[PDB]
């Protein structure tokens, strides 16, 4: 994946989020800080905030990342297609994990979670930090190409104990 795409992945709350455009930022609800009066130094009164299940979208009045073009945010990931989860680690690694996307699901982990499931294509068992997702990774974007353009369709929310199955929050 290209440098500008990775530069959209931003540390946020207890996880990450993704700049879809100069003004739109998406993340996973449970990583969002609570009881705060600003995000990225902007007061709440200059941010349109919409949280729907585990999907959170912010729209800033100020142009926060004018270096960026606006990309398409899909309402979910195309079922059956291969996406990439653009994982950044706080130790500096970039780990784009290939994932084949499945159906909208609800499942009990450890608690019920609701989003789009997928299967990592990284190994036989994607347990641990080298082949799969770990605590701290939530909010990472699920992306794929459409024609010559990249699009984003979800943000990382969960993974099963074995680690092979992942769940992204989606807008719809």
Curated annotation (Swiss-Prot):
It catalyses: Endopeptidase with a preference for cleavage when the P1 position is occupied by Glu-|-Xaa and the P1' position is occupied by Gly-|-Yaa. It comes from the Viruses. Inhibited by the chemical compound K36/GC376, which covalently binds to the nucleophilic cysteine residue. Inhibited by various macrocyclic inhibitors. The active site is at 30 (for 3clpro activity), 54 (for 3clpro activity), 138 (for 3clpro activity). Residues 1-172 form the Peptidase C37 domain. Homodimer. Monomer; in solution. Processes the polyprotein. 3CLpro-RdRp is first released by autocleavage, then all other proteins are cleaved. May cleave host polyadenylate-binding protein thereby inhibiting cellular translation. This is 3C-like protease. It comes from Norovirus (strain Human/NoV/United States/Norwalk/1968/GI). The chain holds residues 1101 to 1273 of 1789 of the full protein.
């Amino acid at each position: 994946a290209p440098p500008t795409l990775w530069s959209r992945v931003t540390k946020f709350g207890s996880g990450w989020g993704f700049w879809v455009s100069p003004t739109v930022f998406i993340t996973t609800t449970h990583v969002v800080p609570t009881g705060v009066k600003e995000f990225f130094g902007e007061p709440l009164s200059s941010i349109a905030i919409h949280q729907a299940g585990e999907f959170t979208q912010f729209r800033f009045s100020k142009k926060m990342r004018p270096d960026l073009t606006g990309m398409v945010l899909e309402e979910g990931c195309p079922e059956g297609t291969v996406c990439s989860v653009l994982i950044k680690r706080d130790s500096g690694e970039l780990l784009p994990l290939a994932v084949r996307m499945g159906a909208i699901a609800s499942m009990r982990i450890q608690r019920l979670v609701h989003g789009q499931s997928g299967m990592l294509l990284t190994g036989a068992n994607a347990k641990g930090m080298d082949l799969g997702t770990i605590p701290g990774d939530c909010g990472a974007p699920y992306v794929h190409k459409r024609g010559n353009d990249w699009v984003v369709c979800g943000v990382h929310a969960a993974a099963t104990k074995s680690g092979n199955t992942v769940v992204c929050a989606v807008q719809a």
